[PDB]
Ligand binder design. Structure first.
Ligand code: HEM
Ligand code: HEM
Ligand SMILES: C/C=C(\C)[C@H]1C/C=C/C=C(\C)CC[C@@H](O)[C@@](C)(O)C(=S)/C=C2\N[C@@](C)(C3=N[C@@H](CS3)C(=O)O1)[C@@H](O)S2
Lengths: 380, 386
């Protein structure tokens, strides 16, 4: 909520998990909601059918931040049955067995960027040169987007967390660019992600395809960049980077542990109960919105032994960083793969990587909910 | 012969030399002379015979085409080598550029075509097909194959324009050193990343073979050749399609595309000339004997319009069945990227005729301007609408 100078959780989480599992919290908007922090409460909030996303569009419902965007055609603001139809299409697209035509593009973009880091001026900022551009360049290649337009996609997303009409403006260039992009691509015989989306509209409405495309690009850039910058910074400060260099087989569990520990937001999309719901820690009333804090759930000693310790070898790691239930992250398999190949390539090409400053000098983004370091200087 | 022409039509000297003066002197831009072979039978022989040398053109007293350069005088350029070294590097190139490896790059060709036609399709009309399609398509593929950051694409393109040749100066020496340097740094970065692109395959050929200087210069050359030659031929190819209306034949009958690719290669050969061959003793060509130490220019474009080989050679016909052209050269130096090039041209036409069937020249044929200077010929723009 209030800017922290590092990636330390707010201590109000541990307090709420101990004795105030389902208490009000006042959000940046000034409105309040019940904050669920215990794993089991968050699990239930994310899986139960008795909560609605679409109800948060109603004019009286509470908001997390001040403003609009709040789009009625965004996947995150829909309920069954509409919601279910678009997800069926997305499983058909992000077929875990269609990733195979896509793995090479991920590795190629990593090799590209790690090479550039490798011959760059030390000390290098790993954010600007690696962690920020890797996911945007990946999403762009998969959407058949000219590399000349990637910086523009980055700024529109950054703008769309900037003051109302400036955010409507930037949403309007993205939607417009994307619909145009689409018109161009219809009729080519393509096999990229953008192509599979287009061809699902011949099950997706016009505005559905456009907004889904926009969201896939935004979703798959900001979160991954966040998690990866954070993950690398923890690897470097704990010295667990070296563990991955010496034992590359540990990279899978490291990815999971980074997801758990580095969950980029402390908050979550509100859920509205459509009737009185019993969660494990208590009953929450109909019409009283709940915030699921997956970040808090991820550091719950009921589930994770020694929750505040970062351990790349952690075997039991059912984190909620991809959410859960129906809104479970659509790009979960791509993201996990991006993270693995990122760590694989970087530890292979630069084993003797190390932070070029002390942790406490690194600055973190202030405001905009999502938390992450502003720069990660390294040398070797 | 490389003097200004307002279009892509051949020098009429070609028809007269083929008629009555097959192996006659020609003066080159440099001021120096060579024998100009124009008949298909002579050009074939000049390219395939083991009695001609490329390397001997490096000797300081040998004739040159251009008046001063670096990259073409480079001893480590594949085009400036004879067996056995030439053979070593070629077999490395065969183990990289195999028919199988090209079939495993296919999606990346299609994807860059897909991208760029889509942007053609949505462009403000009339769209210049050169700037939006023919120029970027192959440079962007090559760069993708070499792990080159997309921001670095125009640098590669301008450099390659300088080494091709007025725009001539001692600048085609400064360009070589910037490309060479950039590429060496690209290599440094890339060794140890474990990628599966072309540039990785070249590096893993050096490591335990290709020398450092061979690797560097070959990578630079693969970048320049895979862009400038393909770019020109494709632009030329599309322009002839549109001006003949044979574009429509391909839209209505896509199975014609392969013969169209060959006929484009034949008719649109981007050069009037070719790299000098030095005979290493007296050689009897079909049209006459050439003297030891007397250089011959093989004009593959003249050969391609020889009425002894090709009926109605000045007619462009996408249905003409297999008649070996020489646009890829012949013999030992036969173009190493030939199969990527044919594939790039086949996909460009497959994609572009599918997306924009009713494409048409936005201007009169004769209104188009052609690149001046350079050893390649090609139109500056190809404006179109639909
Ligand atoms: C490490 C990176 C990522 C994290 C931490 C992450 C996390 C999440 C989370 C937690 C949600 C659910 C939100 C909620 O229910 O409150 C979500 C939804 C979503 N994710 Fe992400 N994501 C990541 C990467 C990606 C990628 C690469 C894509 C795109 C391919 C993507 C696309 C989506 C979409 C479309 C949704 C909305 C799904 C729905 O509402 O049904 N994610 N993501
Ligand atoms: C339409 C496309 C192309 C044309 C018209 C073309 C033409 C030629 C010709 C005629 C030669 C031989 C010159 C001589 O023997 O004097 C040659 C050499 C060569 N080409 Fe091309 N080429 C094209 C595309 C490519 C591509 C895509 C590559 C890139 C990988 C490439 C790489 C090379 C190399 C490395 C050589 C030198 C081989 C040697 O000297 O042994 N070419 N090309
Ligand atoms: C410009 C040629 C490139 C980029 C490559 C590869 C293969 C092309 C051969 C073709 C298309 C045939 C004609 C070509 O030989 C000619 C006469 O047009 C040219 S362009 C001749 C010369 N060019 C220079 C700049 C170089 N060619 C070699 C090494 S540098 C090269 O890169 O070939 C001069 O040496 S002479």
């Amino acid at each position: 909520f209030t800017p922290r100078p590092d990636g330390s959780p707010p201590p109000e989480f541990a307090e709420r998990r101990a004795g105030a599992p389902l208490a009000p919290v006042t959000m940046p908007s000034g409105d309040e909601a019940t904050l669920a922090v215990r794993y089991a409460d968050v699990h239930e909030v994310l899986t139960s059918p008795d909560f609605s996303r679409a109800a948060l569009l109603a004019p009286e419902a509470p908001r997390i931040l001040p403003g609009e965007e709040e789009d009625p055609n965004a996947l995150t603001n829909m309920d069954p049955p509409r919601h279910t139809r678009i997800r069926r299409v997305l499983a058909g697209i992000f077929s875990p067995r269609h990733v195979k035509e896509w793995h090479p593009r991920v590795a190629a973009m990593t090799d590209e960027l790690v090479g550039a880091v490798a011959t760059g001026e030390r000390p290098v900022d790993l954010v600007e040169t690696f962690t920020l551009p890797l996911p945007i360049q990946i999403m762009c290649e998969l959407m058949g987007v000219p590399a000349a337009d990637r910086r523009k996609f980055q700024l529109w997303t950054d703008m769309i967390i900037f003051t109302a009409e400036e955010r409507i403006g930037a949403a309007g260039e993205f939607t417009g660019y994307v619909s145009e992009l689409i018109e161009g691509r219809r009729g080519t015989g393509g096999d990229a992600l953008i192509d599979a989306l287009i061809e699902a509209h011949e099950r997706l409405s016009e505005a559905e395809l456009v907004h889904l495309t926009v969201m896939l690009i935004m979703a798959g850039y900001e979160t991954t960049a966040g998690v990866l910058a954070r993950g690398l910074l923890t690897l470097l400060t704990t010295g667990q980077y070296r563990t991955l260099v010496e034992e590359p087989a540990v990279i899978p569990t490291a990815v999971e542990e980074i997801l758990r520990y580095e969950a980029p937001s402390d908050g979550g999309l509100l859920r509205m109960p459509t009737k009185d719901v019993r969660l494990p820690s208590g009953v929450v009333g109909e019409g009283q919105a709940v915030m699921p804090s997956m970040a808090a759930a991820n550091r719950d000693p009921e589930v994770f032994t020694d929750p505040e310790t970062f351990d790349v070898r952690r075997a039991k790691c059912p984190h909620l960083t991809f959410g859960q239930g129906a809104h479970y992250c659509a790009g979960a398999n791509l993201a996990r793969h991006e993270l693995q190949v990122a760590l694989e390539t970087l530890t292979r090409r630069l084993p003797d990587l190390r932070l070029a400053v002390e942790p406490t000098e690194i600055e973190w983004r202030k405001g905009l909910l999502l938390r992450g370091p502003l720069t990660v200087p390294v040398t070797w």
